[PDB]
Structures are given as structure tokens and as C-alpha cells.
Amino acid sequence: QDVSLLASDSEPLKCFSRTFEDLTCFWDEEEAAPSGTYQLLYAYPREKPRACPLSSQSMPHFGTRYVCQFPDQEEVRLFFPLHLWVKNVFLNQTRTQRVLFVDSVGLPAPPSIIKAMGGSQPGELQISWEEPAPEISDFLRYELRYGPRDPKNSTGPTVIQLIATETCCPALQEGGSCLISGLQPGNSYWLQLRSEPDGISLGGSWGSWSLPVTVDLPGDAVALGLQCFTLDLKNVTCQWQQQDHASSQGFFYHSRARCCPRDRYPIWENCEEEQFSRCHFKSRNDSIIHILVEVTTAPGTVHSYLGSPFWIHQAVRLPTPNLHWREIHLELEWQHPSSWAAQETCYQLRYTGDWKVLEPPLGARGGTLELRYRLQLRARLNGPTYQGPWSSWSDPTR
Amino acid sequence: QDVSLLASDSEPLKCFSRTFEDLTCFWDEEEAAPSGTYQLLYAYPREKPRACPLSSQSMPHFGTRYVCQFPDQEEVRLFFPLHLWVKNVFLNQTRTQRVLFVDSVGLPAPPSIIKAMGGSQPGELQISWEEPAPEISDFLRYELRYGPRDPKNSTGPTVIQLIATETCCPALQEGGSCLISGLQPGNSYWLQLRSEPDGISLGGSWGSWSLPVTVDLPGDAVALGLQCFTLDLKNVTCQWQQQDHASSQGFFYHSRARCCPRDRYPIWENCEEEEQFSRCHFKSRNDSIIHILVEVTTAPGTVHSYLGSPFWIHQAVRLPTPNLHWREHLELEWQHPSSWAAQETCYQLRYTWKVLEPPLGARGGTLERYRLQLRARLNGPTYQGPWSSWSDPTR
Amino acid sequence: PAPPACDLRVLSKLLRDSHVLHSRLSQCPEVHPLPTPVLLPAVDFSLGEWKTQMEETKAQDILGAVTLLLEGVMAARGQLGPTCLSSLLGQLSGQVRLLLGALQSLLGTQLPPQGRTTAHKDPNAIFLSFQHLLRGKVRFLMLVGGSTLCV
Ligand SMILES: *[C@@H]1O[C@H](CO)[C@@H](O)[C@H](O)[C@H]1NC(C)=O
Ligand SMILES: *[C@@H]1O[C@H](CO)[C@@H](O)[C@H](O)[C@H]1NC(C)=O
Ligand SMILES: *[C@@H]1O[C@H](CO)[C@@H](O)[C@H](O)[C@H]1NC(C)=O
Ligand SMILES: *[C@@H]1O[C@H](CO)[C@@H](O)[C@H](O)[C@H]1NC(C)=O
Ligand SMILES: *[C@@H]1O[C@H](CO)[C@@H](O)[C@H](O)[C@H]1NC(C)=O
Ligand SMILES: *[C@@H]1O[C@H](CO)[C@@H](O)[C@H](O)[C@H]1NC(C)=O
Ligand SMILES: *[C@H]1O[C@H](CO)[C@@H](O)[C@H](O)[C@@H]1O
Ligand SMILES: *[C@H]1O[C@H](CO)[C@@H](O)[C@H](O)[C@@H]1O
Ligand SMILES: *[C@H]1O[C@H](CO)[C@@H](O)[C@H](O)[C@@H]1O
Ligand SMILES: *[C@H]1O[C@H](CO)[C@@H](O)[C@H](O)[C@@H]1O
């Protein structure tokens, strides 16, 4: 019955239930506190009145606060009126009265333990928690607060109502789960939760926030320049710029429309490996793959970085083509080893006798250039069905 | 019990409930109609049968149609088996019988009042209606039909089931609303609405169509040559060719990702006469999409509404043409006006008038008496702009 | 075809209509205690007791409570005249019959014995008991049980 538990208001005898299996009522009087003066009585509609054992607290003023706690031997029944009246033993007066529906009053406790970890996208945060009272997991609506850390602390904390499992945030699945997107990829966040019974079935108010928990988001992988491809729709090979004085390793993950993270779906798997650090492994296509890289900057400290999810058919790297040169004015002629599609490949040529480039139409096999010079052609697949990044640069052609 | 209610079929004793609080069953006989001969009876799983007050109607032939309409809502109960059987009391014959579940014969009425007009996009139509029976709007599935209001028709009517999803089509809000795209611009339309209960809990069938309502889609503003641009992300100015013998005014509207309509959602704001051609300007907002509407009054008492494609404020920044430095193979150099992203700017040039456009990424270049010209398109990953302010002729 | 009881929209509609009807009840000042007390079911329960019972016992209790509530409403409506309270109780009886039909479409017709009962006089007690029955045991079963009642 601490001061932080004073969210109640507008009653002479305030009562509140935390798990809908316990009850405690209190009242405060500004006058003095003679010993044994006041007794609290209660009675369900059938049994005789019974006296709750009292306790006294010392207010900052000269008054005192009297608090009752229902014995565990007695049980509280929902949807049942309860008559509570404080009776002075000396003057026989009834200081206060109230008829209470236990289901209408509620101060649910915040979740005891919270988990906050990075999700699939670089700007997604996954939150999972257990419930102090798992029996009423379906009759509670949660509210979520997250805020930036000491840097940029001027911005006010943001709240969000965890609606339901329809938004991939099931309150029950024992403990619940949720996923929140749009956070800044890389700065730490402090997080707090909240709860409130839904007025449809159980009435009440909000409980206090949980102890704030800090989560370090992975962040975008562009900080280390993670750009990689796949070859001929069969194998995934990823190489990243190796961080100086820090060993780095990378993992991966596969999924197919898993959507809602009921039980922390992302489970990493090691990538086989045989300046810049590379990795390589097999693939099961027509799936979404999330790529992660972890680097140990110092012994015992590691950092996780995440890049945009790949589509294998959308990131295939073509073999580097070769170009033939002709002149009288200078003509062009080139081919493509990957004969899957020519009009789906957008080429580019860098020329120099300060470098300048031009983009011939996709599918072209020849052209004219103005001029000794070296010709280097690069291919990028950009078809509506198959696409991918740029290929390697071929040897210069005179 | 009118002729429009012949959609029911495949039973000697038809029944239908429009609001799930009333019931009416009718059967027709082609034979003679002696007075007080047929009596309709009904009974719930445990009760004495009662007689519905019967009525009669004429038919094109010598036969007649009888109609029974239940008196009170207390006599119609959902989720119970209802046993209906008629009686030829003249000679004691149970002519017909049927066991009926009231929840499976819904025939909802069409939305009585329909309101629609052009949407935010040039080819977007927004529709809103008030359900005649809002108490069961949860269980109702809607369908929409529309066609060209012009004489004859270029194509047949098209029917689309409203998804009733979060895509800015909240079939229930007690009115409803929805937004449909893909419609052709600049032509009149007529549309109708229809409803059917979802067979999840309460079954039924489609009701009658609503009365057609005419809608004139505004169309696109390209026919008026609309083009807007901003100067240093401060003010947005718009321009369109001056239609002859017709005054015009331009409107602007700002919105965030809350694109879902709610009644008259676009709040147009009048422009100001800036100082053939036409002009407008207003203090635009930030980090939001803007919409431009231009209306032309070709004749008194009438006006044609045209709408332009919405865009972000930072995608159409107008860069004034910069200076030029050249020497007589040619040497190219320029001084970018706003050097925030000076390298990321496309400078197409002319030589004499057509010439190749060198790639961006530099403040100078080279080209292989003469006449020269250039432009400056603000093209960058973070900021974009059109081919604004093509330079004056240069040597 | 799933039973209509396992569609959550029906229960929400019942709750909304009951709330609207109870709000309407306050608009007729001719409300007076009924000449004869009527029997009303028992809706109170405790979570510790609730978790001990099995699904079948819960369903039987729900059916018995709803049937007894309907019987009480029908008995109470006979004590009135053509006044407003008669119409309100008729609409309440219609809603209770809708609830009973929805439940019977899923839980069968095997009603249990009468069980623990209580009496009341004021007409507001009937509406309060119906609201408690909708918000309490019925919704608890239909939410906590989930798919065990229906696929
Ligand atoms: C207190 O007042 C009640 C009500 O009049 C009375 O029945 C009871 O005997 C009184 N008790 C004392 C101790 O005065
Ligand atoms: C992938 O790489 C492995 C070794 O790195 C190789 O054995 C295999 O043939 C490659 N292709 C496929 C489809 O696994
Ligand atoms: C997946 O790979 C197999 C074998 O290379 C190929 O037949 C199939 O078309 C591929 N599907 C996709 C979606 O890439
Ligand atoms: C009609 O049939 C019923 C049996 O359902 C019988 O009770 C009744 O007497 C008969 N009446 C006549 C006029 O035949
Ligand atoms: C929009 O914001 C940018 C930077 O936040 C600022 O430079 C610019 O002046 C603003 N423009 C308007 C119209 O608010
Ligand atoms: C924008 O237009 C308004 C029109 O009222 C004008 O007052 C303001 O000075 C303009 N701002 C700029 C930067 O031109
Ligand atoms: C819970 O607490 C909030 C204030 O944080 C109230 O405004 C709300 O009504 C509820 O009682
Ligand atoms: C969590 O913290 C807020 C203040 O930020 C309190 O007002 C609330 O009662 C809860 O303890
Ligand atoms: C090809 O490679 C460039 C980097 O050189 C990428 O930025 C581009 O997106 C494409 O994948
Ligand atoms: C409603 O009406 C349509 C058109 O008659 C039927 O095809 C459909 O089965 C539903 O009953």
C-alpha cells in the first residue's frame, strides 16, 4: 500500500485488486491515531460481517493511514457485491461505506521479466514477457513505453497500445509476445510495460510501469559495408569488410511467411568459411533470408549488425562479360555468358584514353564510342523476373 | 412481397428476413382462390402451432399469391428450427411443409442513401453510405457495381467485393466508407451497392441493388498542363496554361500517411494570385504529401474539376540555372547555386541544338565560335527535382 | 459449418444490446418493485475454483444458468401490465432466448439440475444478472477455452 500505489482516486475508502484473487482496502485520516479505535468490516451477501485485521502507516502529515489485507484463508469471488464499512469501536459511528464489485477494481502488476532483442528487419524490436497472473492473460490490455537513452534524452517517451495478435502481438501464446518496427537502427532504447483490464469483462485501471530494460539494437550493416550476392541461384556467399583489430563472423536464417514471432522465430545458423572476411553456405530458395554479422571489437564484447533481407532470385550475380572493340570513330561489340536473358541485363561501360561512363540500352550487343583507350564493361541484371546487383569488372579492352 | 423479391427460388414456400427481426413467407398457386381456404401455420421446437394472418395478391394469370408477414419480433427467433406447414382447411390437407432456420434466409436491403465524389488521387473514387440496419452491419458483406454514365457503354458493368480491410475501406465505421482506385479519369460514372450476410454465423443471399447514383470523376490535370515546384524548400508555386474565356482557382491540401477518408476528408485551401499563363503560391507544410486541385469555370454556373498527381515537397525542388565557365574539344565548368548536394545534380547541355548529357558527380567536365546551353535537374538519393530553369542561350 | 456460438461477433452484439437496453431502462420512471420475487441464477465465481472445473461442467453450468435466467424473465414479465417495463422485459427475454439458442447450437440440450439459486425483487436485478452472466462465466468459457469447444 505504498505511495506509488496511489493511482486510485475519488473514493473515501479506496480498494484495489492485483491478480483478482487478492484484495486490500485503505483509508487515511488527518487527525491523530488513538490505538484500536477503528475496525474494518466486510461481508459477502450471505455470510455474517467479519472484521479484517488492521495496520497503520505514518503519513508525511500528522495523520495516519489504515490498511486492511484480506486473509489468504478467505477467497474473493468475482461478479459479487461486497459491503465494506469502517466502524469506530468506541462511538459506534460508521466512518465510511462502499459496495464493491471485485471485478470492477483492478491494479494489475507490470510483467516481472522482459526480453528485448533485435528482430528480422534492422528496425524491428521483439518484446516477450511472462505474466504475474497467467489466468487473466486474455482479460488484460497492455501499453508499451520506449525511450532513447541519456543521449537525446530531451525527446519525450512514446507510448503504444499492444492491440492484439492480429498485429503479430499476441498477449497470450506461459507468456505473451510482440514486435515493433520503425525504431532507429543502432541506438539503445530503454523499455517499460503496462497493463489494464479490458472493460468488456473486468474493470480496473493501469498498474505501475515495469523496471526499465535497455536493449541495444543491431543497426544497419552499411556501417561495415555489408554488400553480397548469390551465384546461379544455388549458393549464398557473403563477404564483408573486416573490422580492424576485431574478429568478425556471420550467421544467417531462413523463413517463409512465418510473420508473427510467437516463440522468437529467428534462430541463426553458422556460415561456412574457408582485409575482408567472407562467408558461404547453401540455400533453399523461394524464401526470405536475413543476414547477420557479428564482430568482437574487444575480448568479451561483441557487436551485432544486420542488413536488408535478401531475395535469392532478386540478388543473383551474373558472370562478367567480355567486350570486343572496333574502330575506323570507334565501334563496340560484346556478348554475355549467361544466355538466360539479354534485355534483362543493364550494362555500363567506363572509358578513358576523369573517367566517364555511359549506359547502352539493355540487351544491346554493340555500340559506337568516340576516341589508345581501355574499355571495361559491367553487367547488372534488372529484369522483371530475375534481377540482381552489379557483376565484377572484366579486364580492360583496347 | 413485390415482384423484385423473385430472387428467392428452389422451394415451394419461400421465406426471407431483411433485418433478422422480421419474417415473411409467401407461396403462389395458379389454381382458383376460394376465400378462407389456405391457412399458414408455424411452430418452434416446442409450442402449439399458431396461424399467421394471411393475405392475398393477384397474378398475371388466374392464380393468386399468398403472403404471410409475422406480427412481432417476439415470434422470430434466431438459431432455432422453425417448422412451417400450410393447411388446406377446406379438406384437411397439408399441402406443403418446411423446416427453417431464420438465421440462414437473410435478404438485406441495399443502402438507402449513397454519397460519392472524386478522391485524393486523380483516378480514385471514394464511396460512403449509411446502412439501413446498422445493428447487423458486422455480419454483412458488401458488393459494388459501376459503369459508364455516358450514352451507350464502352464496356459492361464490373462487380467488386469490398474487402472490408484496413486498406482505407472500413465497411463499418452507423455509416460506412470505402476507396476504390483504377477507375478511368475524366468520365461520368454510375454505381450501385448490394449486401449479403456472411455465412460464418448468419446465412442469407444478396439483396436488391440500390438506385444508381451518378458520379463525375474529376480526371487528371495534365490536360491543363499542371506543374508545381518549390524554391529552397520554403514555398510551393504551381502553374497551368490559361484556358480561354474561363477563370480558375487552385486548391491545396496536406495529409500524412492517414490517407483513409472519413466523410469529406480533403480540406481544400484557396490559393493566392501571384505576381497564356497562370500562377499560384502558398506556404507549404513539411514532411508530408500535398495535393493540388485546379477547377475551371468554362461557363457561368458550371465548373470542371481537374486534379494533379500528388508528390512530396522535396521531390520537385526548382533550381535556378547556375553560371557558366567555358573555353575553346571544350572545357566545362559551373558554380552550383545551392551546394548542399552540388555533385549530385544532372547538367544536360546543348552544343551548336542537341548534345549528350554528361553524368553527374562533378562541378565540371569536358565536351568533344559555338553556341551552348545547359539545364540543372536536382537528382539525388535524398532530394529530387524536375528540369527546372533551363539556362538562357550561352556562347 | 461451425456453430454460431463460436463466432465472437454474436457475443459482442449480445453485450452491446444488453448494455443499450439497461441504459434505456433508466428512462422510464414507473419502475417499482415486483409484486412477487423471481428466481435468478448464480453468476459469482472465483478463479481458483474456476481453474479446477472441467470444460463439461462449465458448459452444463452455463446452460443451466441461461435456462433459469430465461425462466425467471418469463415469470417476471407476467407480473406487469401494458407498461414500459413489460416491453423492456419482452426485449430482454428475446435477447436471452437468442443467447440460449446460440449456446444450445454448440453445447447440446442436456440441461443439468437446477443448482444453487437466489431471489430478487427489483426489476434492475434481472438486467444486472443478465449483464453479469454475459460478462462473466460465458465469456470466460468462450475465451479461455478457445478451440476446445469447437475445432
Ligand atoms: C451500534 O448501533 C446499532 C444501530 O443502532 C445498534 O444495533 C448497536 O447495538 C450499537 N452498538 C453499540 C456498541 O453501541
Ligand atoms: C555450394 O558450395 C559448396 C562448397 O562451398 C559446393 O560443394 C557446392 O557444390 C555448391 N553448390 C551447391 C548447390 O551446394
Ligand atoms: C529454386 O532452385 C531450383 C533449382 O535451381 C529452380 O528449379 C527453381 O526455379 C528455383 N526457384 C526460385 C523461386 O528461385
Ligand atoms: C384434420 O386432421 C386432424 C389430424 O391432424 C384431425 O385431428 C382433424 O379432426 C381433421 N379435421 C377434419 C375436418 O378432417
Ligand atoms: C522543412 O524542413 C527543413 C529541414 O527540417 C527546412 O530546411 C525547411 O526550411 C522546411 N520547410 C518548410 C516549408 O517548413
Ligand atoms: C510564401 O508565400 C507567402 C504568402 O503569404 C509569403 O508571405 C512568404 O513570404 C513566402 N515565402 C517565401 C520564402 O517566399
Ligand atoms: C489508467 O491510468 C491513466 C493515466 O495514466 C488514466 O488516464 C486512465 O483513465 C486509466 O485509469
Ligand atoms: C510509471 O511511471 C510514470 C511516470 O513516468 C508514473 O506516473 C506511473 O504511475 C508509473 O509508475
Ligand atoms: C551494384 O553495386 C553497387 C555498389 O557498387 C550497389 O550500390 C548497387 O545497389 C548495385 O547492387
Ligand atoms: C447472391 O446472388 C447471386 C446472383 O443471383 C448468386 O449467384 C449468389 O449465389 C448469391 O445467392
Ligand SMILES: *[C@H]1O[C@H](CO)[C@@H](O)[C@H](O)[C@@H]1O
Ligand atoms: C439488381 O439488378 C439486377 C439486374 O441488373 C437484378 O437482377 C437483381 O436482382 C437486383 O435487383
Ligand SMILES: *[C@H]1O[C@H](CO)[C@@H](O)[C@H](O)[C@@H]1O
Ligand atoms: C525532364 O525532362 C526529361 C525528358 O526530356 C524527363 O524524362 C525527366 O523526368 C524530367 O522531367
